[PDB]
Amino acid sequence: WAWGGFSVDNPTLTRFFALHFLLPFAIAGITIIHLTFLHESGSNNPLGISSDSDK
Amino acid sequence: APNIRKSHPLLKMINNSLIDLPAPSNISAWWNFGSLLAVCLMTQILTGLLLAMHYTADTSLAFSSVAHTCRNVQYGWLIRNLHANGASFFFICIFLHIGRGLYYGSYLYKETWNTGVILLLTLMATAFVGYVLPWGQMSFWGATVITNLFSAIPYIGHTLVEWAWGGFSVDNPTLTRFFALHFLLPFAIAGITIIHLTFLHESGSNNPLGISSDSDKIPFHPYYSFKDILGLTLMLTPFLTLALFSPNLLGDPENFTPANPLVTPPHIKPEWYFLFAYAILRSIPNKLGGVLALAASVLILFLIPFLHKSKQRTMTFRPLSQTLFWLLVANLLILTWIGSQPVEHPFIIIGQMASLSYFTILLILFPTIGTLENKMLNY
Amino acid sequence: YTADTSLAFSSVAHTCRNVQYGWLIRNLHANGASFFFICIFLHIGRGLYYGSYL
Amino acid sequence: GELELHPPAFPWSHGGPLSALDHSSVRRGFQVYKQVCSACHSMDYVAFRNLIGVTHTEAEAKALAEEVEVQDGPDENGELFMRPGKISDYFPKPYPNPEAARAANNGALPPDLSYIVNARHGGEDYVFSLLTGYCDPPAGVVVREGLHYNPYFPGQAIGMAPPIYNEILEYDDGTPATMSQIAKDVCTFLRWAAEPEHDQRKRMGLKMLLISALLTSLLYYMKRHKWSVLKSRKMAYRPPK
Amino acid sequence: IHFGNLARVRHIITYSLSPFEQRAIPNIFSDALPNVWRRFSSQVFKVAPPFLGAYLLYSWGTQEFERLKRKNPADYEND
Amino acid sequence: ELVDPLTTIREHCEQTEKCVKARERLELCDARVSSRSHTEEQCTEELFDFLHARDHCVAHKLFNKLK
Amino acid sequence: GRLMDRIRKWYYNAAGFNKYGLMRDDTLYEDDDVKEALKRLPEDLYNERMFRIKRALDLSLKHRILPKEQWVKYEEDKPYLEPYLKEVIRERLEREAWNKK
Amino acid sequence: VHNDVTVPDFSAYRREDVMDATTSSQTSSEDRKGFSYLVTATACVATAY
Amino acid sequence: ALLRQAYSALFRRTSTFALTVVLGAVLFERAFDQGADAIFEHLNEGKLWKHIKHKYEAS
């Protein structure tokens, strides 16, 4: 199904181009979510103790 | 917090915009087009990707890759139909969305309005470059006609155009960059749409009576989730009826002929949704003036928020404005019609009249009648 | 680029050989993929070592 | 040069939104093409396998393709060579390129017929009227050498000599090969060559409508059911007054 | 947060019925249709006019165009 | 020999008030156009009016007599 | 003169907000001045305006209007806000003017 | 006072089975819900198809 | 009373309501397709290959 045939051939290439063009945008989108969840807590720091006393 | 629909950093967003979001209790069917536009967008992107997986952007293979898709791909013909006709459903919906806002003074929500104008400009560019991809006769000539208009911009004229073409005429390097652009823009549309709704939520929706609905608000769900789903199938019926019973009703037969640079079609005209602008284009004999008139035919929308004189928001209780509004709508059907006709008498003069009245109504009459009506209310 | 078995390889060569700075862009894109992964492995490492995963 | 005659609307058996193609007519139309039009007209997008289950048997299809020699290659020595056709081959091109096509038709170019009924306004009504509409030029009109008068063709002077006449061939299904019968069949065939999905597309339209009718009614009731609460709602202003 | 900060409202009572105690499309003939007609009536002379005008202009222009394609015998009466 | 219903129905239709009138204006145009030696005129318009009238008539009946 | 004094009554009925039981002032777009004006209204006037509007919205969602009997009559329309709104605008214009000086 | 407040008449909208004020409305409840839910369940089947 | 039975057995507990939609869809499809195809072929007698096939089907 993925190949669109019996071996890696032209129909695979064309759908891989489509996917390659598309996924990076999904990466950009999910990155926004990544930072959104991150901002809920803020950054962790190298000593691993609360840095609210010094931000 | 008690329920996880409010606490969670994500659901909270889905809740404050599609479930617990405060909506006016009296919004009509004209408010169903935003959601249809959203659904319309998700569907174009979907059918677009499905087609992209079989398309080849090369002058020597474009036409046939599209044919191969229709003839060999399982349901390729269906997907091609839906995507092509989806473009029209998209524009129908967008013109009704815009109309609704002009008639109800939704444009007083300036940012929501401006991002909206941007969405429309992006949607056009998308459809324009998308149209070239099959590389048929109208595909190539449309590209050729329109892109050449800009060589008329003094100085950076031939430069900007030759840069855009990637050569000396609309050729293969144009096709490949247009495919990249056609794939890209819809995603910009999806992004800007988020901004559109973000500004919108700052105020909430306007309503048909144009007065504060804080006294009577209802949750988006189930009232509008149901109203919108219903509105989806009501529109979706005429859509599918067209794409299944009359697949080529709106298309130019000229596009079933491979592009040929040595054979100008007799009548180079756009898709229905561009006709009105094409008319305004040809109304001004003078390459430069016509281009500006063309540009202005859409950019005019950025001025609407500044030409509001009425003391009331909508045109519900403004009879004079109401007829002026329908005159405008009729004006646009005339321009649409003129655009599909050859450049000859009587069409030429009718064209200039409709183009001229188009701008008069928006720039002069609307603000004037609005003031007049303020006096007739003793304000 | 042209996504077709018969033109892919050469479309990329054409890009490198004819397009103005095509070679540079091609290089930057191909090498950027590695920069991306180097950065991601250091990003992940950091999180494992500092319990960011909490 | 100005003024044009528009074909009439014939009652094709596949014109109804719910009416398929008469596959019997399509099968005949294929013969016309094969034995008449295929002499100058290419049909690049159709292959013999396409006929199977539409107008022909798999055996008939395989036979039809073998009547043709296709150029395959290269071989061991990098040579081109001939071979009998397979059902995977597309209908043979009459000429190598358009230059040769024109060369053999007085610089005129007979177009590929794969999408002709959609590449022309009027469609099959146009092609039918054109094929059966040849006649003599009216007073004041002179057709230049090599061209033939056809009122239905734009400019009225076409480079295609009337392609069909009565009994120009025999329908092996025993149908009276009158000129109009032929044009009728070949046009039906051309409709099919332009869109093989035709019947399936219509069958789908039927299901779409029924489900659409059903689903819309149902959703209307639900929308109404929910809103009934606000529709019948009553309010009153009761100030301390 | 948007529910509870909207408007300062006082002294208004409202009565509503569950959807299961009432009818979805009640009084189609006594209330619905009359109103549909009422609404149509109230707008017809505001909407229709310009569309009718458009139609006329369309018919004129289309016929005027076909008429200019015909020949005027008054160009061949001399010969 | 065989007979093409097309030709048959063409005759029947040309015997219509509509065609008879169009056919009449045609013959007149032909007449004066053929009898001059420096005129521009052509009878396309008249021929078209005839073919239009006839052919519209043929369409209504032709397919009935075809398989 | 008493010329447009008629035109008005005509427009007033042409407008049609009285069919919802709304006063002219009820239909005003709430810009900045109107908002300040509304804050100055006496409680009773304010609550009445509120009911009138909530009522109108309910009629609008129902796609109905008031029975011909309940329609506000041109001559019985209360310009309850125009007085306040007039003051608000002067005050504003005073400041604007003064801040330039 | 609140004692003077009463619920308007919903006879113009009540479903036939709950029109009469002296009849238990529970007896016809599974009927009224069963019907509306039947429409919905059908919409789902139409959509799942 | 079917509506009551339906309600009690099918539409009351959300689990059974979903089971009804699934089982309902499986049955609706089978029936709806056969029906539509039935209609389509009747409205097109002797035009489909299905119809004329026998004439050349004879090895």
Ligand code: HEC
């Ligand atoms: C001797 C070659 C020959 C044969 C055989 C022939 N054609 Fe053609 N046909 C042509 C030529 C040449 C043209 C180009 C006419 C022109 O463009 O002036 C043409 C053009 C056409 C056109 C219309 C072109 C237009 O621009 O509208 C159609 C449709 C067509 N042929 C149909 C047929 C069909 C169907 C048949 C078989 C019944 C057929 N032809 C057989 C030579 C032929």
Ligand code: HEM
């Ligand atoms: C396209 C890839 C990614 C992008 C753009 C991205 C971006 C970011 C950014 C900008 C931050 C804040 C700055 C920082 O702390 O470095 C962040 C933090 C973080 N990311 Fe990513 N990230 C990516 C992938 C990942 C991956 C693969 C993981 C681990 C599986 C991850 C785990 C985290 C975590 C846990 C933090 C918290 C850092 C802390 O301890 O303060 N990220 N990321």
Ligand code: HEM
């Ligand atoms: C891809 C195109 C667009 C999308 C997806 C989109 C989506 C939406 C949605 C979902 C809403 C809320 C529901 C509604 O009121 O219909 C909305 C509201 C609005 N949009 Fe758009 N829109 C689009 C284009 C535009 C354009 C072109 C304009 C005008 C130039 C515009 C102007 C507005 C305004 C002003 C509102 C406020 C509605 C109100 O008065 O309450 N939108 N749009």
Ligand code: HEM
């Ligand atoms: C805002 C959404 C979109 C619009 C308005 C749109 C519009 C169009 C138009 C006008 C055409 C020409 C239709 C025709 O063949 O006559 C087209 C073709 C095409 N579109 Fe889109 N499109 C959209 C999104 C996409 C996306 C996201 C993709 C996929 C990444 C895409 C891929 C294609 C492809 C492959 C073609 C060429 C094949 C064909 O002509 O059918 N489109 N599009």
Ligand SMILES: CO/C=C(/C(=O)OC)c1ccccc1Oc1cc(Oc2ccccc2C#N)ncn1
């Ligand atoms: C590539 O040509 C695409 C066309 C098309 O209609 O795509 C949907 C097209 C076809 C034939 C002739 C022209 C064509 O393009 C266009 C493009 C166009 O673009 C605008 C629309 C509104 C405002 C400004 C412009 C510009 N420029 N306005 C009218 N026709």
Ligand SMILES: CCCCCCCCO[C@@H]1O[C@H](CO)[C@@H](O)[C@H](O)[C@H]1O
């Ligand atoms: C508005 C919702 C419309 C949905 C319509 C669904 C109809 C699709 O039905 C289709 O019919 C074809 C012809 O029989 C079959 O070959 C397909 O497999 C089938 O999915």
